[PDB]
Design a protein around this ligand. Sequence first.
Ligand code: UW5
Length: 464
Amino acid sequence: TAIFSDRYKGQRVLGKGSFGEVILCKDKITGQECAVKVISKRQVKQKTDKESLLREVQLLKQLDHPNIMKLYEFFEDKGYFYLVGEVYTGGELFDEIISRKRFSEVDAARIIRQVLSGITYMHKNKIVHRDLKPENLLLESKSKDANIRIIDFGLSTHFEASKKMKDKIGTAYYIAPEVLHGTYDEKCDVWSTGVILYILLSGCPPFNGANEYDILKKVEKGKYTFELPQWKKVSESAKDLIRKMLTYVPSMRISARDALDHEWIQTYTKEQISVDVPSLDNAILNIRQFQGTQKLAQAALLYMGSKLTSQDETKELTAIFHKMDKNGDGQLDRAELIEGYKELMRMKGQDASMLDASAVEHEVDQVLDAVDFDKNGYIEYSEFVTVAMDRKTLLSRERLERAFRMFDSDNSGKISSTELATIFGVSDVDSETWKSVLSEVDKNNDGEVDFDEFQQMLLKLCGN
Ligand SMILES: CC(C)(O)Cn1nc(-c2ccc3cc(OC4CC4)ccc3c2)c2c(N)ncnc21
């Protein structure tokens, strides 16, 4: 058996995805950079057996298509699976799209043709995505012309998805109805793609609602409409493909492969025949609203999660250090700080960035250097822990402020309670619950909160 960390060193965290963290890693010999998805066996249950997982992995490694993330290597130890793939630096598609000021059916067809091309290839090889959504569409690089790379093709079959809301934000919009009821095949990926297309041309989800369950209720009925004013600007051809992708009964839904031949794809992907190319201004602005909303809700939930973790870890670390403190003087040396922090990781295991003893030593060293000025031998375990725990908080609180600022597009400094409803509905915090909380933060408020007030609301919503 091969050991992951004998071959790769963790450089930095790329983000948090379905089933676990993705870490930028580097081969310790060749220097090749890779994006490693680390799946915690304790947080993510397997659906299949080891036989079946290894076969899929072995197949996946052999597949090559320009629109599918390349898998290079697969590792397993006691506590995790490590999926090693190519790293892409262009970010999520929609985050790129909202940075444009011009966006047309030609742009959308370029995009969707890639997606369908990737899907078609994977379906030929009898791999289904099932959880296809905009997060799973990355851009190869930061270029304008960058190819799309679909991530996470095949994992859904072998791993059971988190039931935590922080992990399933914006899943409901894209799931095919047959997935909800249990009998599904590869046509579910066409539906998901159709939802994404609808969004690209209108900037609104076709199936929408105030909370996760209302969205699902709409999905399951399967009814949607084109009566939004911004569809008047959209080709009939595009709407036709949409209807075919959003066909309820899977045996009647267009295949990925056939979707590629559809008139709309054939017409709007000719690099030069731009016969009518208006820019879909309303759509792009709806998408920017949509995206900012999703990202703020996500950030709020991870903020609350981080605050709950730091309660847990602070107490556990203190108890570990306390017991290591044989003097009772409240001081410890470096090796002991490292040992307890490893003992913490021994227990916690939510920290894929600490892939070996070498990662731990350096985090501890970041903190001991950060202890401002240094006396060597006898260190006040109390303050360490304060600062060691106070990293992650602000790191996930920075993102909160960033996301608040990004959502507040008119730079008003505040969020209206209408907007709060939308954000909390998306985050699935019950309506009565968040208003009670508001009322306690600012007893005088007039239907809007600034960043600090919003933050105070979140703290109350995670039991502080
Ligand atoms: C927010 C994040 C962390 O998920 C962003 N992210 N996530 C990934 C990513 C996402 C899923 C992966 C899955 C893997 O297993 C293969 C797909 C089946 C291997 C690497 C994977 C890498 C990523 C990447 N390759 N390059 C740049 N950013 C990436």
